DNA sequence: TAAATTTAGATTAATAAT
DNA sequence: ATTATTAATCTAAATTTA
């Protein structure tokens, strides 16, 4: 039977909403150690999440929209073997509505733009010609109290399609890097250093975790590991899970990071340094060159991996991909199985057989 | 030569309408 | 209920700036 997305997309329960569930039946092959956490986009081509679940011990995915955790939607799926009781959110939560997240937008927001939430944060922002086209479309009716509904359709559909916010007289501009940084739960300028360019900043932010959601999911580890954890971070990026564990005050004794982008690794090393992390950070580039024996040796040296967290590329799954949305076997999304390979190695030592 | 700026629809799920 | 519509969507790549 096909996997059907839950409506509402509250997963096993979100804060301030009904429907919390504290118990879950997990397959025996799914039991830890290690605890593992896999994330990807929910809106994939057909049959993708079924294959991911089949390769991850048949764990039914938890489908969560981060719009219950911040101002911007993020319909993601997470497969894990974590306990689902005693979850708690990191404090303080991000601003929930557009009115609170963008305090100056009052001055420019139109009454007919009835948006309360922003759409998903992607790696492609609206173009300046888009802002100028909306400005030119609405200027003729400046002296009129409200433009007729036929242009309202166009402008509202463009604002939703490109996730624009009102900043000037008739200016609907996309989000700025620090804006999506705060919305995605990262501290200010978390991705500003390391010689990363603005374009690379956008691409890395669009591809990242919403820290509050992942932290709500990972909070159950705090009572389990009083003296810190060993982390295997696959497809680390700008370090979503690391920031989440940092906000959860869960000591990260060791982090083996695997991330091919050098500016991403520099951002992770920066975050490690500016937060004065006591533990050790090890960085790897290509997961395809990470050998099974390297994983086994690292485990023997440090004592296994308490948690294996990652999100393989959603490249060939995202609906925004025009040319190469070929599914799980795409050149980049297929790296998912790489994840599964390293996970098995870890399991081979912690539970064995 | 790195950045930034354009230049490009399709696939499903959700919702409304038979 | 079967199905029309409405809607959301962690992008790729070819130019052009600077
Ligand atoms: N072959 C490979 N080996 C290691 N990492 C890879 C890879 N191919 C792609 N990646 C990386 O995998 C990442 C997935 S995006 C996940 C990062 C996000 N900040 C998060 O916290 O989850 C991308 O940053 C991409 O650069």
Author numbering: 274 to 626
Task: Quote the study on this structure.
To address this, we solved the crystal structure of the DRM2 MTase domain in complex with a DNA duplex mimicking the CTA DNA used for the in vitro DNA methylation assay, except that the target cytosine was replaced by a 5-fluorocytosine (fC) to ensure the formation of a stable, covalent complex between DRM2 and DNA. The crystal structure of the DRM2-CTA complex bound to cofactor by-product S-adenosyl-homocysteine (SAH) was refined to 2.91 Å resolution, with each asymmetric unit containing one complex. Consistent with what was observed for other DRM2-DNA complexes, the catalytic loop (residues 585–596) of DRM2 enters the DNA minor groove, with residue R595 intercalating into the A11′pG10′ step on the non-target strand; on the other hand, a loop–helix (αA)–helix (αB) (LHH) motif of the TRD occupies the DNA major groove centered around the (fC)TA motif. As a result, the major conformation (conformation I, relative population of ∼0.55) manifests greater inter-strand distances for the T12′pA11′ step than the minor conformation (conformation II, relative population of ∼0.45). Detailed comparison of the two alternative conformations of the DRM2-bound CTA DNA reveals that Thy12′ undergoes a negative propeller twist from conformation II to conformation I (36.5° vs 29.6°), resulting in a greater inter-base pair stacking for the T12′pA11′ step (136 Å2 in conformation I vs 121 Å2 in conformation II). Such a difference in base-stacking interaction between the two conformational states is accompanied by a differential interaction between the CTA DNA and the TRD of DRM2: In conformation II, Thy12′ and Ade11′ are in proximity with the TRD, reminiscent of what was observed for the DRM2-CTT complex. In contrast, the corresponding region in the conformation I moves away from TRD by ∼4 Å, resulting in an increase of the distance between S400/R406 and the backbone of Thy12′ to 6.2 Å and 7.5 Å, respectively, in the conformation I.
Here, we report structural and biochemical characterizations of the intrinsic substrate preference of DOMAINS REARRANGED METHYLTRANSFERASE 2 (DRM2), a plant DNA methyltransferase responsible for establishing all cytosine methylation and maintaining CHH methylation. In plants, the establishment of DNA methylation in all sequence contexts is mediated by DOMAINS REARRANGED METHYLTRANSFERASE 2 (DRM2), following an RNA-directed DNA methylation pathway. As previously observed, The DRM2 MTase domain is composed of a catalytic core adopting a Rossmann fold and a loop-rich target recognition domain (TRD), creating a catalytic cleft to embed the DNA duplex. Among nine CHH motifs, the DRM2 methyltransferase (MTase) domain shows marked substrate preference toward CWW (W = A or T) motifs, correlating well with their relative abundance in planta.
